[PDB]
Design an enzyme around this catalytic site. Structure first.
Site, PDB file in Angstrom:
ATOM      1  CG  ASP A  35      -6.458 -16.778  23.252  1.00 46.26           C
ATOM      2  OD1 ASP A  35      -7.194 -16.728  22.243  1.00 46.26           O
ATOM      3  OD2 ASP A  35      -6.379 -15.829  24.064  1.00 46.26           O
ATOM      4  CG  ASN A  40      -9.483  -6.510   7.712  1.00 48.04           C
ATOM      5  OD1 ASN A  40     -10.076  -6.367   6.639  1.00 48.04           O
ATOM      6  ND2 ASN A  40     -10.052  -7.085   8.770  1.00 48.04           N
ATOM      7  CG  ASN A  83      -1.939   1.153   1.181  1.00 41.03           C
ATOM      8  OD1 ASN A  83      -1.799   2.103   0.410  1.00 41.03           O
ATOM      9  ND2 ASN A  83      -2.950   1.074   2.036  1.00 41.03           N
ATOM     10  N   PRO A  84       1.018   1.899  -1.165  1.00 40.50           N
ATOM     11  CG  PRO A  84       0.516   2.867  -3.225  1.00 40.50           C
ATOM     12  CD  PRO A  84       0.313   1.611  -2.425  1.00 40.50           C
ATOM     13  CG  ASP A 106     -11.982   0.376   7.484  1.00 40.65           C
ATOM     14  OD1 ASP A 106     -11.830   1.616   7.534  1.00 40.65           O
ATOM     15  OD2 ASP A 106     -11.113  -0.399   7.029  1.00 40.65           O
ATOM     16  N   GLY A 120      -0.573  -0.695   6.573  1.00 38.65           N
ATOM     17  CA  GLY A 120      -1.124  -0.559   7.906  1.00 38.65           C
ATOM     18  C   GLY A 120      -2.091  -1.680   8.210  1.00 38.65           C
ATOM     19  CG  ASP A 121      -3.593  -2.400  12.168  1.00 42.60           C
ATOM     20  OD1 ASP A 121      -2.992  -3.498  12.183  1.00 42.60           O
ATOM     21  OD2 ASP A 121      -3.481  -1.554  13.083  1.00 42.60           O
ATOM     22  CB  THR A 154      -2.909  -2.980   3.684  1.00 41.93           C
ATOM     23  OG1 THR A 154      -3.130  -1.615   3.314  1.00 41.93           O
ATOM     24  CG2 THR A 154      -2.507  -3.775   2.441  1.00 41.93           C
TER      25      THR A 154
END
Ligand SMILES: Nc1ncnc2c1ncn2[C@@H]1O[C@H](COP(=O)(O)O)[C@@H](O)[C@H]1O
Ligand SMILES: Nc1ncnc2c1ncn2[C@@H]1O[C@H](COP(=O)(O)O)[C@@H](O)[C@H]1O
Lengths: 285, 285
Positions: free
Chosen positions: A203, A72, A10-11, A262, A67-68, A70
């Site tokens: 877990d 996800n 992700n640029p 999101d 980041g998160d 991308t």
């Protein structure tokens, strides 16, 4: 046969030298894999599409640089595929909760440097209705210097309506009234690494916290509990774990969830753990 | 003789139609005053200079159109002058604590409309060393949705060092250890109108609050006290009033105050009330 990897970049993640980080990652992967395909995201959904196509093509490994959001998407593209590539990622984001949970270096260059194909961990994945999550499902959450954060924040609890939630968790039934419900997979949420100290990435459980607030005054009292880290129920909040469950409203209202940062599915939602669902490259801890 | 007023305008205060508000105010004042001088601020200090020059010229009234920064300057220019014009203001700012304390309309057009030269109130002014303040002297203050405000804010208390303050107030002496000291003049601070519910603009007192925190854990516990409004000392904070006092450090360190939102004098500071120091045009409440 030939070991192949895709690198999903992700640029828009990261800062100035993020492009240089891409080069380092690509040349590192080329030492480890006979073939490396580099894919750059342009819009929402791209990372998920790239990861899924990599799975369908039976690539050995899928790597995400972003980041998160991308991460996800990437994990969502792999989830419940008959064959799933091993998953790795190089955190460029501002938060990177998953990186924290796996004890990866915060620094991208260091993360690339310390990538070891032999160092892996099983990784639970969350499922919410038809979608997947990797960090959290949040419900109902959206001059004086350091004090202003409360006067803004401690107040904004007031702006938080309470809802008559029904929780059907592992065949246990209860109705609660709360403004805030969180369901997490790991110890770290929103960059707060000690929020769920007992949660582990493998877990096999979903970890639920809800505030026992009806007033603005009970919600505020829950704040020190959250700061210490939630490992038990208190006078101000409840902590539960479950494998499968449904959350609904007793007075049906349009209430939309927030999933890994999101906007996600509206209630009712059915949440499930996919235990040890992925093999992820992890830290040396 | 001839009734004269100056209108001091901060063009950077307010939004799009702030220029139109200036026109309304000017034509309103021209109904009330034989002569109206309109002065626009360009930099820090201008409003103070304009207000002082208006006092030296024995203008009947001084009006400020701007935020708290411009109102402070204006009042600072009048303070302890042998002759002081009556003071009025039209709030354009985002907060406007003084407006709240005087029950002025939040809306600029309404404030202009309801200006009544007969409707006045005495107004205390604060003095800190060689300067003046009108709202507050602050010492030591500078995905999860609504919860993030705490995880950012409740945390940022940790970043707040504690200091060995000495308080010499109305000839009463005490040493405290605290991360946060606030000294206010009115009920409203930083837009929080109920912070000091017992404070009145003309009660002739300075109102002091400090947190009894040594840990990050005691500071957090003070937050509900602040939200309810400070009218007494508690387990987590102390509330005092005084007319004259000195605040210093027992282990002298460079500690700078924040005065009405701007960096102010370093400790030690001597604070004094100037009771009923100005005549201000107020609301019809
Ligand atoms: N090429 C791009 N330009 C701008 N935004 C993008 C691009 N690719 C993905 N995004 C967005 O970036 C967000 C994810 O960023 P992150 O959370 O840093 O992984 C999502 O909202 C994507 O739609
Ligand atoms: N013409 C101007 N342009 C930009 N900033 C200004 C101007 N006049 C005053 N200021 C600044 O505006 C601040 C006060 O604004 P306020 O708090 O809204 O009254 C101070 O920092 C002043 O230096």
């Amino acid at each position: 046969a030939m070991k192949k990897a895709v690198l999903i970049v992700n640029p828009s993640s990261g800062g100035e030298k993020a492009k240089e980080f891409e080069t380092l990652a690509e040349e590192k992967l080329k030492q480890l894999f006979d073939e490396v395909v580099v894919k750059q995201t342009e819009k929402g959904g791209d990372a998920e599409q790239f990861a899924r196509e990599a799975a369908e093509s039976h690539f050995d490994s899928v790597f995400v640089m972003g980041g998160d959001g991308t991460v996800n998407e990437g994990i969502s593209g792999l989830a419940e595929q008959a064959y799933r590539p091993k998953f790795g990622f190089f955190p460029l984001g501002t938060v990177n909760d998953l990186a924290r949970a796996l004890n990866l270096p915060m620094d991208p260059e260091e993360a690339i440097q310390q990538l070891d194909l032999e160092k892996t961990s099983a990784l639970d994945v969350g499922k919410i209705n038809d979608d997947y999550f990797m960090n959290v499902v949040a419900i109902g959450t959206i001059k004086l210097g350091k004090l202003a954060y409360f006067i803004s924040g401690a107040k904004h609890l007031a702006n938080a309506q309470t809802y008559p939630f029904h929780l059907s968790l592992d065949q246990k039934e209860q109705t609660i009234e709360s403004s805030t419900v969180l369901v997490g997979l790991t110890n770290s949420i929103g960059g707060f690494e000690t929020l769920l100290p007992e949660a582990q990435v493998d877990d096999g459980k979903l970890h639920l916290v809800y505030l026992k607030d009806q007033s603005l005054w009970d919600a505020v009292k829950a704040v020190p509990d959250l700061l210490k880290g939630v490992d038990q129920s208190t006078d101000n909040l409840v902590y539960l774990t479950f494998k499968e469950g449904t959350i609904s409203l007793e007075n049906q209202e349009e209430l939309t969830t927030n999933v890994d940062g999101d906007e996600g599915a509206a209630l009712p939602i059915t949440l499930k753990i996919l235990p040890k669902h992925l093999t992820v490259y992890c830290g040396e801890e």
